[model samples]
Structure formats: C-alpha cells, structure tokens
Target chain A: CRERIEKDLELLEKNLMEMKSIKLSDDEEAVVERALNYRDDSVYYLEKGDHITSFGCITYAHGLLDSLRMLHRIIE
Target chain B: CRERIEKDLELLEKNLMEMKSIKLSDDEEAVVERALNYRDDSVYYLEKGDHITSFGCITYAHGLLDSLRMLHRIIE
Candidate 1:
C-alpha cells in the first residue's frame, strides 16, 4: 500500500527538504534515469491503449528495478 | 514475460519455494498490496471513466516498484 513506501526510511530521508532536495547520488541518478526511460517507454505504449505493449513496458520497468536493486546492494 | 521475474532470481529464493507450489511471500505480499492499491484506485477512476486518474494510479504503482527495489537491496 502507499503506507509502506511512504514510510520507507531511506526514501523518506532522500525526499527530505523539498525546497533544497538532495540530488540523486551519481549511482542513484543512474538508477533513476533508467527507471525514467522505462517509464517514458511505458507511457508511450500505454497512451496507445495497447495492453500487450503496456505489459512489455511493465516488463522493462521491472528489469530496471532489478538493476536498481543491484546498484543499491553494491553501494550498501 | 512473467518468465524473467519468475526465473533468473538469485535473490527471490524465498518466493521460489512458494512459486514451485504457487505460493506468495511477505515481500510479494507488500508488492501485491501496492499493486492491489493501484488496481483499486485505477478501478475507482475507471468506474467514473476518468482516464487521467487511472493513469495517475498506474504512475503510483510504477513508483512503488522503485521502492520495492530498494527494499530488495537492503535485504540482500
């Protein structure tokens, strides 16, 4: 639910100070960039209302998450 | 393909046991919770036939994965 992620410790810290929010670290930025690319692609297909293509977009998003997880582990 | 997430998982072992017998996990529970929340929100807007709100719900669900990836990294 929105509760879990909303209360996430690390992410909450990352989002602190909206007026002067900390930039995504180099690695974090990379993960986010990848996620954004996937999101853009997803929206492209989703706008067409193509369920199969949208699913493919979801697939790409999931892969981006996997890569992001790897990056997080490496940094941690 | 459901195959990528269903397979090639060095970190998803906990789910694999359940997957073999078709079960779910605590993490999967969280993921499903957010997914369901998104589904419900999407349905709410869709029932009203509001395309924008439905898209918002999908966007929210997509963001949830980014958090889940962080959680996966922490646990790993």
Candidate 2:
C-alpha cells in the first residue's frame, strides 16, 4: 500500500538473484533450496499485502544463501 | 589430522564475531540464538575431530547472520 514496501521488494529480489552467481555444493544447494522456498512464501505474503511477513520470509531466504556462500568462501 | 578444518574454524568464528556488530530486535535475537547454538555444536564437533558436523553447523549459523543483516540492511 506504499512505496517503501515496493522498493524493499525489488531490492530483496535483486539480492536473491545475485545469490545465483555463486557455485554451490550438494549440501549447500539443499540449504539454498529451502531458503528459496521461503522466498516464494515471502512473495506470496507480499502479494497479499502483508509486508511484515514478506520481509521476514525473504530475510530468511537471504540467510540461507549467505550461509551457503560463506561455507564455500565465495568472496563477497 | 588436517589444517583445512582448522582454517575453517577460525573463519567461522570471524564471521560470527562480525555478526555481533549489528543491533538485533527481540525476534531476530531469538532466531540468531538458535543459529549460535548450532555454531556451538559445530565447534564442539570440530574440536572432537568431526569436521563434517562442524562445517554443517556453522554454515547454518552463518546463514542466520546473513538473513538478519539483510533484513536490517546492514550494508556489507
């Protein structure tokens, strides 16, 4: 219902997209996939006008991606 | 019997330390605590010569840190 959430949504999408550039191990992939599931849920809530849930879910997804990358020492 | 896990341990520690620089909300604190518990378990296993579990635990911890930082927009 406002521009803040609109902007936050795009930035979150951008971060998720950047995560794909990193190479992942089988275990890492497993974890990242779970995160993506949260990303999907985040989008779901965002579309429903629940910005709080949307932010919370997407942040968790980002966490998974970060963990996967750090374990591999994928330089930021 | 190896330096790989030794090196991994320190890096994981460093990441956890950096995470402390951020200010977390109550809910975020709860989530981060779970990850830290995993990190502690990871350290226990790493010290006991179980590199596999150690790596897995810390990676999940790192994931939590990433999520929290992203949500707060704590740049880099």
Candidate 3:
C-alpha cells in the first residue's frame, strides 16, 4: 500500500510541477501552489509512516488540481 | 462521531451556499460549483451511513473553496 501511494504521489508531484509552468492566470497559480503544498504534506506523512494520511493528502492535492481542470485553467 | 461530522457538514453546507451568491469570477464560480457537487456527495454518503466517505467528501469540498479564498476570489 505504501509503495502504491508513493507511486501515486510521485505522479501527482510531476503533474503539479508541470502545472506550475502552464498555469494561465494568477488565480490559477494560487490553486497550483495549494495543490503543491498538499503534495508536500503527503510526502511528509509518508515519511512519518502514515499511509492513510498520506493518501488523503495526495487525494486532496489531486482534487485541487482537477478542480482547476474543471475551470479550464490548466489543460493537464 | 457521526453527530460531529453532521454538524461539520451542516456548517460547510451553509458556507458553500453563501458562496453561491458571492463568487467573483467565472473561474471562481466554476470552483464553487465543483465544491457544491462535493458537498452534495457528502450528503449522499451521510444518508447512506458511510460517515467516513462523507467526511472525505466534505473535506475535499472545503479544500476546494478554501483554495479559492487563498486566491482572494471570495471574501467569505
């Protein structure tokens, strides 16, 4: 489970980084920053051996980024 | 535990509805819509007696709206 979450977290991190460069507006950039913070929080929880918390953090990060997509602020 | 979540859910619902009339931009409105959908999902899970799932849904909804606040798109 930890391995699976780590893989998921890594992918989310990459997606968020890509979004950093592709964000279309200042408002969108703020959300990208919020998502990246959640990604970092996921990493923090993972390092502390809390897989469930790590999972929630990453999921929330993805949700934030996906919401940006909903607004058409970022393509990917 | 369920009662606690229910109370939290109610407050979130009220806050979300208040945001409905106060959204500032098209992009912000899109996020408000997404957040409201998650709030509905939270209510659905609560009705189904899936408190954990409901909690996650509400949390995600709040996170989306809070990120919007972080962007200064919504005042309250």
Candidate 4:
C-alpha cells in the first residue's frame, strides 16, 4: 500500500506541475485548482498513515485532470 | 477497506443519478459523461476484488464530479 501510494503521489505531483504551466479559461482554471487541493489533501492523509484517504485524494485529482484532458480543455 | 469503499460507491451512485436530471451545455454534459465512465470502472474493479484499483476509480469519479460542482456547472 505504501509503495503504490507513493508512486501515485509522485506521478500526480508531476502531472499537477505540468498542468499549471498551461493557460486555461477562468472556469477551467478553477477546476484545476480544485484538483490541486485534492492532491495536497492526499499528501496530508498519507503522512498521517491513512492510505485509503490518501489514495482517494490523489485519484480524485487525476480524475479532474483526466476530465479536462478528455474534453480537450487541457492537452497533455 | 470494503466498508468505506462501498459507502463511497453508494453515495457516488446516488449523486450521479441525481445529477442526470439537471440540464447542461454540451461541453458540461461531456464532462459528466466522463465522470460516469469512471464510476462504472470503479464498480467493475470492486467486483473483481481489486480494492485498491476500485477505490482509486471511485475517487476519480468523485473528483470529476467535484470539479463540475465547484465550477457551478452542476449544482447539488
């Protein structure tokens, strides 16, 4: 659980940083910001040894980013 | 793990169903559709007993939905 969670956290942080470089409309930016919040929450929970909550947070972050990517609002 | 995952799934499914009733623009509708897809994936993994994957899937679904909700695109 720790191994997988760490990997996901690393990947998500990288993705989040890359995403912040892209310009988006005001509303789109808001969505990305929310995703960032979830990523932060994941890390917080992980540090507290709550892997389940941590996993959920990071996945949610990915989901938000994925939705934007799927909509062509944010290109990889 | 199973207990919380089930609760999250149940809540997400309820939220998803309620969301379908609201009217949305085409693009917003597309975002919701992606969220639904994630929700379905969550269920599939859950049934397969990959709880880790299942948890991730459901959270992603929630994350997608949350973005829309945060953006005021989908009201509660």
> Which RMSD values do the candidates have, in order?
10.9, 15.7, 3.7, 2.8
Highest TM-score among the candidates is held by which one? 4
Estimate the TM-score of every prediction: 0.35, 0.44, 0.66, 0.78
> B32-76 in candidate 1: lDDT tens per residue?
465457646655765676644454455445444444444344312
Q: How much is the lDDT of residue B16 in candidate 2?
A: 62
Provide the DockQ value for model 3.
0.33
Please report the TM-score between candidate 3 and the true structure.
0.66
**Model 4, B27: alpha-carbon shift in Å?**
4.6
Q: Which stretches of candidate 1 lie over 4 Å from their true place?
A: A1-33, A38-76, B1-25, B62-76
Q: What residue pairs are clashing in model 1?
A: B18-B23
Best prediction by lDDT: 4
What tens digits encode model 4's per-residue C-alpha lDDT throughout B1-76? Answer: 7887889889887877776667777776787777778778888988899988889888888877776675565642
State which candidate, 1 or 4, has the greater TM-score: 4
Higher TM-score: candidate 3 or 4? 4
Clashing pairs in 3: none
lDDT of model 1 at position B49: 65
DockQ of 2: 0.12
- The digit string of per-residue lDDT tens for model 1 on A1-76 reads 1222223323323422231334455555554566556656655666676543454444435434433443333211
Q: Rank the candidates by lDDT, best first.
A: 4, 3, 2, 1
Off by over 4 Å in 2: A1-76, B1-4
